[PDB]
Ligand binder design. Structure first.
Ligand code: MG
Ligand code: MG
Ligand code: MG
Ligand code: MG
Ligand code: MG
Ligand code: MG
Ligand code: MG
Ligand code: MG
Ligand code: MG
Ligand code: MG
Ligand code: MG
Ligand code: MG
Ligand code: MG
Ligand code: MG
Ligand code: MG
Lengths: 60, 107, 24, 131, 61, 394
RNA sequence: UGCUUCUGGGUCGGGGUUUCGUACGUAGCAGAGCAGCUGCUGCGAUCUAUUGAAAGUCAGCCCUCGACACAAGGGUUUGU
RNA sequence: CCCAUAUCCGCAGCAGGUCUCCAAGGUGAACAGCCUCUGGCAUGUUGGAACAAUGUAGGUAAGGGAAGUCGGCAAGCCGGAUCCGUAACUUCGGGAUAAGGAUUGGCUCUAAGGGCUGGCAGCCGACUUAGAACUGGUGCGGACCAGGGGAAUCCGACUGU
């Protein structure tokens, strides 16, 4: 429905950009009713949202 | 008779011949949707994200010439529609397209 | 939005404009 | 008896061909082509075996700064023969030839095409190789 | 009719086809197509390019 | 003032209605004039443009430099299957115009001719000519048809015959056969109508109509090129680069003083798809079609007296955008009007043709059957395999 | 222009033609040479064989009667 | 909070204007152009179907080479680096990258250019320069970056406004 608030707060908690914020497409309603940094940290501990890894840029 | 899963190989090249560079892969998606609507008489065609990735593997300009598609007519689940059945469109990884017939696979 | 001011004057056909001139 | 057929023409007014005989000249600037009626915005052009009016651009001082009549022998533009071959040459070449047909030089370097050789007998006599 | 062979390739040129080229020194060459024409004008060896007849006569195919 | 440097005009006013042609088949505007000294024959035919190739022949003209030489010339292949006669029509001569008097169709009319009378053959019930074909197996209908033919003996002056092409033998996609009136020019009206009734429900080949080295007229519609500019259509001089409002245009239309633009001013519009009639086309060879006897078929149509090869006129990979020619064909000097798969009207010559170039007898030497679909370099399949050798797939 | 005479279009595949020019992998006491161990083993652009090979080929190219499903359908109207 | 192709000024979510800081990897002389990583975005007041004419922005053309035009207008040629070589004239500083040539790819080598510890020995870290061989359809500053040149006449010395 609307997850830009949770994506911005997840970027602010994870201390990175929202390009690396992965939200769970299956558990949309469990993320949408968080609405707070304390609940988004619980989403981090549950593992519903995951820090995306850095896009590779090889030196080889 | 209604629930039929089967194989096809689409020649994307003869359907994509003519269009400009920034409008090749969306047109290829549109001709795959028209291919599904032509072989199967269902307006509700839902093509898979794996076949989206397979068409958009190279780029928007270079689209593969032949592609292997499992076309499946299925009975409709809930959220009922005036379309009685739908068509799922799936990618099949095939190495070479040499002597590939339209195989009617069984359930 | 307030009332737009009248379409402004633009010296379009003076001595400065070579696009149209009369017999001189 | 046998007249000349039309061939492809690619040397208009302005072309500096080279002078393929032993007069002393190196270039020939085409100033006009002899035997053209004319039409609005068409340059007179000369193919193989065409009588042309030229001027020695560089060479001998006795040859320069005056108008000579010439015959165009070789052209680089591909022209169609009647038997169905598209014979074309390495460079654009002509020789200084007067109003009656007699050449001014003695020998001719390079090959002379048969479309020029059948039309001009005195050029074909000085030519060693034909086409 | 005289079926003359191609100078670069060695193919049998038919009288409807070809483009014949004569240099200033002599040695009038015949060419089947602009492929062989461009190869001769760029001065490529017919024995080194694979699809010619001289490559086959050199490498015994 | 006046034009400084006078110039010839771009275009011709004799062809100025440059519209898309209402008819698709080439209509004969004028047939050759009849005379009773000549016997009865057809004066036209309706073929289909197949393709293009070379030709090799000797030139026999005294005085030329090209005498006794081996030239090449462009030729048109026109596949000309024998047409089916399915009717006749007579024409009375009035001071208002040459009016059609009475049209009499045939009894057995093929489905190829039945396709033409329908715009939609799929939804139709195929019920044409049903009440007309009942006149051929009754007493009163034969009497009425005999009265119709007897009135045509008396009052008709011009008798044209109705013939349609044979589309099933052709490799085209369409099945709708083209119909055509051909004016029979020959003896008297009675002998003409008797010969037409004898040739009713019959095949008409091309050897009966035309012959060798005959100068003929080619009628047909131009290859369509769509809406084109005045530079593309009328071939006017392009304006220079520095023009603001376009350069592939006509700069001046006309003067201030005929407050209108004249009809002769070259404007932009439809280029191509125009009905045309070109004259003086020379037939080199009327080739025989495919025929089967003694088991194996005989197909050596490109075989001449000097070639002696078993190849056909069908090139390698077939004709480009046409298919393969299995029927009997004609081969004409030069180029004809129209694109591929285009219906093409043949006609006998209007002018009394007696010229040195036109009365030349042609002896063919070589017919080029190489692949026109690209740069072909082989004449036939066995020659290609003999030059290449064994391949990987073999 | 085509849209059921067990017949016809279309899709795929197969050949025909043709464009470029010899694919990946493997093998080679072929390779300017270099390093390591007592002739062998590694790096190496390039060359040869497989291999006129590989790839594309109607979107407006040519034949298939080889597999596939489709095709006796829907609507508006017109009378002497 | 915006701090600018949407939070400011231009009548506006206006291709205009507005003063600063932070500043990765490769290629490369470079903070030039091109690709990528962090960060950001949906193509800049909309989409769908065909690819007609005239357009606008890019290009390509056999043969001729300015014959077009008021006028080489526009486009094109040359373009980087290394090794040669460089004229008339001059205020001797310049002209000058004058003009005119050759080479440039990949791979495999050789030589030269150094520190620390106890003419010698041991241990290590750097990018360059020069030369040779082999090899690719003579292709090699392969995209990008990137001087057309010469001889004269008039005016103004010039840099600048
Ligand atoms: Mg002029
Ligand atoms: Mg006048
Ligand atoms: Mg202007
Ligand atoms: Mg062709
Ligand atoms: Mg905006
Ligand atoms: Mg960019
Ligand atoms: Mg855009
Ligand atoms: Mg958009
Ligand atoms: Mg040019
Ligand atoms: Mg050129
Ligand atoms: Mg001038
Ligand atoms: Mg300029
Ligand atoms: Mg100077
Ligand atoms: Mg003076
Ligand atoms: Mg100044």
């Amino acid at each position: 429905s609307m997850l830009r608030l949770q994506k911005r707060l997840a970027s602010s908690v994870l201390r990175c950009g929202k390009k690396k914020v992965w939200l769970d497409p299956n558990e949309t309603n469990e993320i949408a009713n968080a609405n707070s940094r304390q609940q988004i940290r619980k989403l981090i501990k549950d593992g519903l949202i995951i820090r995306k890894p850095v896009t590779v840029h090889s030196r080889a | 008779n209604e629930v039929v899963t089967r194989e096809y190989t689409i020649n994307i090249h003869k359907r994509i011949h003519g269009v400009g560079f920034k409008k090749r892969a969306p047109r290829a998606l549109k001709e795959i949707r028209k291919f599904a609507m032509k072989e199967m008489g269902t307006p509700d065609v839902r093509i898979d994200t794996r076949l989206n990735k397979a068409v958009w593997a190279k780029g928007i300009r270079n689209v593969p010439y032949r592609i292997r598609v499992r076309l499946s007519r299925k009975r409709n689940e809930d959220e009922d529609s005036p379309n009685k059945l739908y068509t799922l469109v799936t990618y099949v990884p095939v190495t070479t397209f040499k002597n590939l017939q339209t195989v009617n696979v069984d359930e | 939005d307030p009332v737009p001011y009248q379409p402004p004057f633009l010296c379009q056909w003076g001595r400065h404009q070579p696009a149209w001139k009369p017999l001189m | 008896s046998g007249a000349k057929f039309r061939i492809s023409l690619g040397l208009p007014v302005g072309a500096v061909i080279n002078c393929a005989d032993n007069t002393g000249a190196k270039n020939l600037y085409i100033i006009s082509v002899k035997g053209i009626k004319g039409r609005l915005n068409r340059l007179p052009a000369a193919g193989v075996g065409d009588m042309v009016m030229a001027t020695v651009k560089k060479g001998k001082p006795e040859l320069r700064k005056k108008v000579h009549p010439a015959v165009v022998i070789r052209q680089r533009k591909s022209y169609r023969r009647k038997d169905g071959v598209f014979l074309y040459f390495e460079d654009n070449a002509g020789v200084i030839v007067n109003n009656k047909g007699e050449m001014k030089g003695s020998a001719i370097t390079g090959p002379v095409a048969k479309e020029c050789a059948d039309l001009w007998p005195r050029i074909a006599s000085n030519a060693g190789s034909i086409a | 009719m005289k079926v003359e062979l191609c100078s670069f390739s060695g193919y049998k040129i038919y009288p409807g086809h070809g483009r014949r080229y004569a240099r200033t020194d002599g040695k009038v060459f015949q060419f089947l197509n602009a492929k062989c024409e461009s190869a001769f004008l760029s001065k490529r060896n017919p024995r080194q390019i694979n699809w010619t007849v001289l490559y086959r006569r050199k490498h015994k195919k | 003032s006046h034009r400084k440097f006078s110039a010839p005009r771009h275009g011709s006013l004799g062809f100025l209605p440059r519209k898309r042609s209402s008819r698709h088949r080439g209509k004969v505007k004028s047939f050759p004039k009849d005379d009773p000294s000549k016997p009865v024959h057809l004066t036209a035919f309706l073929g289909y443009k197949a393709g293009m190739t070379h030709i090799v022949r000797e030139v026999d003209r005294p005085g030329s430099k090209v005498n006794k030489k081996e030239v090449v010339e462009a030729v048109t292949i026109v596949e000309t299957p024998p047409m089916v006669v399915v009717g006749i029509v007579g024409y009375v001569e009035t001071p208002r115009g040459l009016r059609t008097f009475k049209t009499v169709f045939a009894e057995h009319i093929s489905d190829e001719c039945k396709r033409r009378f329908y715009k939609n053959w799929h939804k139709s019930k195929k019920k044409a000519f049903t009440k007309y074909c009942k006149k051929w197996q009754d007493d009163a209908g034969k009497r009425q048809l005999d009265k119709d033919f007897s009135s045509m003996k008396k009052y008709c002056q011009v008798i044209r015959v109705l013939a349609h092409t044979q589309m099933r033998l052709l490799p085209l996609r369409q099945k709708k056969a083209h119909l055509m009136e051909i004016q029979v020019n020959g003896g008297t009206v009675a002998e003409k109508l008797d010969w037409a009734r004898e040739r009713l429900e019959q095949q008409v080949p091309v050897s009966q109509v035309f012959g060798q080295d005959e100068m003929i007229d080619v009628i047909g519609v131009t290859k369509g090129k769509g809406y084109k500019g005045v530079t593309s259509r009328w071939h006017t001089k392009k304006l220079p680069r520095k023009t603001h409002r376009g350069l592939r245009k006509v700069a001046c239309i006309g003067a201030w003083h005929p407050a209108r633009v004249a009809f002769s001013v070259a404007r932009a519009g439809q280029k191509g798809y125009h009905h045309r009639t070109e004259i003086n086309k020379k037939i080199y060879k009327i080739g025989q079609g495919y025929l089967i006897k003694d088991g194996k078929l005989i197909k050596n149509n490109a075989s001449t007296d000097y070639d002696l090869s078993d190849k056909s006129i069908n090139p390698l990979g077939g004709f480009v955008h046409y298919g393969e020619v299995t029927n009997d064909f004609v081969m004409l000097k030069g180029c004809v009007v129209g694109t591929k798969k285009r219906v093409l009207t043949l006609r006998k010559s209007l002018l009394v043709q007696t010229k040195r170039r036109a009365l030349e007898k042609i002896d063919l030497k070589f017919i080029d059957t190489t692949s026109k679909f690209g740069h072909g370099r082989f004449q036939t399949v066995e020659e290609k395999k003999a030059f290449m050798g064994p391949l990987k797939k073999d």
